[PDB]
Amino acid sequence: RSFDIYSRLLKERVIFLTGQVEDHMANLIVAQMLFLEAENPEKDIYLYINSPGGVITAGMSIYDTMQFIKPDVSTICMGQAASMGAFLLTAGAKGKRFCLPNSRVMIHQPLGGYQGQATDIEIHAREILKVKGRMNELMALHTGQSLEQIERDTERDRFLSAPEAVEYGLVDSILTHRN
Template identity: 55%
Template sequence: MMSPTILSYRLLPTLRNLSVQRSKLFHTSQCRHLIPIVVEQTGRGERAYDIFSRLLKERIICVMGPIDDGIASLVVAQLLFLQSESSKKPVHMYINSPGGSVTAGLGIYDTMQYILPPIATWCVGQCCSMASLLLAAGTPGMRHSLPNARIMIHQPSGGARGQATDIQIQAEEILKIKRTINNLYVKHTGLPLESIENSMERDKFMSPVEAKEFGIIDKILEHPPTPTQKQELSSADDSCSKES
């Protein structure tokens, strides 16, 4: 099979069903940009994909933009699909997000923990709020950041209105969510709960070096891996797959 080439930055009329629907969803609710189309030459002729579908073939998922129910539905569906394709090959999740809905983010988080394949996470640009938890939730040893990305953690925020009893119920619920999220950071960073609570009290911005010391990531990547590093990464992926 020949290497894929980018044909254009518009939707081709020959694309159908999932590819078109998925492209429209990204176009309208996530990035609001034109979606590149990738064309491959195969033995049966040309095959066109939107760029995200082509990356999905390589087991790459992009979590880009604010996390809401729409993005969560896309990411969860892709994770479940990739598990059905192979329960051993790793999934690579690239994240560039300011955070967003706690419930949508926890839906993605729970699915990441539920499926069998190891998940490599990559911070590109920023991983703030709920996105930083998704970054930390990758398989240990496979959590990465590019050198100029920013990572931020903080406690959940929200508002309530209505009768006094309703406000009390909402306040109790957000405190429960706060405790849940704190415990998840404890699980993935290895830090004591008291340290996590102190760090989460206000916005805590971190460089990749600081995030590595904090336990959110394992590696900082400045250049593409060399052939030797690729072989080591492949061996680590195989090891994680066997342990799973």
């Protein structure tokens, strides 16, 4: 029926990634995808995104899953897709990444923090550095820009309008009306 609306929509292969990114809402996204791949492993799957960002590992379970499943996950951003949100948007199938008119994007490097003995802090920061390294690589890839270029652009929070977003390479185009 219309008992659950996100369900009816799931049947239309529409998945919503809304707000904060974290393990449980991430895991729910991931399973929603595996389910759509088993249903029909050919049809695209649409993933709407309105999110301030969130936990990185939780984000990579989503990312690796999108690339892993045969279906092409198109991505469409409404409202906003900041940080790992923006990362996921641009991680969508090629040519199948959008942004509605007034949605906004924000990009930036990884945030984190540890607490401990110098040695452990060493082992942990070293690590958040490997991750920044891989986060930037993957962004160069998906967006087209170059490693050097991203790290520059991403050292500090950076905003992009729907247009600037396409111009930059995070999304392929702006959806304006249903034609």
